[PDB]
Paper text:
In such microorganisms, the majority of small molecules are taken up by members of the OprD outer membrane protein family. Here we show that OprD channels require a carboxyl group in the substrate for efficient transport, and based on this we have renamed the family Occ, for outer membrane carboxylate channels. As expected from pairwise sequence identities that range from 35%–50%, the Occ proteins share a similar architecture, with a slightly off-center constriction formed by the inward-folded extracellular loops L3 and L7 and residues in the barrel wall. The transport data demonstrate that Occ channels have a pronounced preference for substrates with a carboxyl group, due to the universal presence of a basic ladder on one side of the barrel wall.
To determine if the phylogenetic subdivision of Occ proteins exists at the structural level, we determined X-ray crystal structures for seven Occ family members (OccD2, OccD3, and OccK2–K6). The pores of the proteins within the OccK subfamily show a considerable variation in size and shape, suggesting differences in substrate preferences within subfamilies as well. For OccK channels, conductance values are on average somewhat larger than those of OccD subfamily members, ranging from ∼50 pS for OccK4 to ∼300 pS for OccK1, OccK5, and OccK7. OccK4 was indeed the most efficient phenylacetate uptake channel of the proteins tested; however, the specific activities are very low and, as for vanillate, high substrate concentrations had to be used. Thus, phenylacetate is not a preferred substrate for any of the tested channels.
Residue numbers in the entry: 3 to 23, 29 to 65, 86 to 157, 161 to 391
Amino acid sequence: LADSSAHLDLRNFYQLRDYRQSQAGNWSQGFVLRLQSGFTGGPLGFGLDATGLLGVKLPVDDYSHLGLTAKLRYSQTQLQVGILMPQLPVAFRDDVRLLPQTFDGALLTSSEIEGLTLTAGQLWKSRTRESDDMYIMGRDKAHASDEFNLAGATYAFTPRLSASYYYGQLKDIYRQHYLGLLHTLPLGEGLSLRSDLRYFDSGEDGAAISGPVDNRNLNAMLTLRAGAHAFGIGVQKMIGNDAFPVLNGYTTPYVANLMAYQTFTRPQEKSWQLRYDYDFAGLGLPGLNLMTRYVQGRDIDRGAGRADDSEWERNTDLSYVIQSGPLKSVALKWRNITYRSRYGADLDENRFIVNYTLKLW
């Protein structure tokens, strides 16, 4: 049993919001207990993981759940059945709040052939700190489905160039095709251009119990890395009459212009991003990083014959991984969020998040 391990992930989360068309605060604490067995010896290996989740309001117990995950392994192929945290282009579980969003399902991954990863899965339920079954975020939770089917392939053509295709199907609600092209171009010592191009095509599926689904999503992130600096531009475009479909539960839309508050995927929205990163290591402060980014959106469809909405958001994050002493490896994050829109809400918000992972064995 020496290959087994246990960890406890701790998250302390404080947010001060000023939302209006009101200054309210929130302090809370997350625990994620991860138990992972090793694998039963032999060609076909067997294992068992357990994931325990607890959210506490700051103290009153707010949310708890315990899930198990059976795992099988053979050569380069793995099957997991039970609690899952998928991080896939058509289902990228949320983890920017207190606790990670989880799913129950079965996920098969296989990397038998050099440079090729194949994925096939089915998710049956979504769980968040807030009566299950899945639906498009923003639509009728009464017209839900217990079956999300996914299949994918990623191929590294060269170590500079890889491509990905994924298919997501929420049975009887929607279908989604994803195409991604990732190109990294070296440009001299400490220099590289990362081109991250993404395309989603979303339509209805089966009985279409939540109504029509019409969205194509074109988005790209170009990132110039230079020594300890990084400079990025993002462009994103919603086409069709619908917002970009994601699974309910604040699942993260896998998109270039995703921000701390808004996703910039509203119906017909066109947006661009500027982002700057700095690693302070060279300056003598390893573990300290600055990220600041700004996204501006327009042409947001408000229907009828109304004027389109428009919006902007700025995010500034200062993050610090403590390098030594009793709190070594404790991570701190200060996030400043500023958001304005023409016809909707305005927001100012500060968050302070402390993360730490304790190894139990």
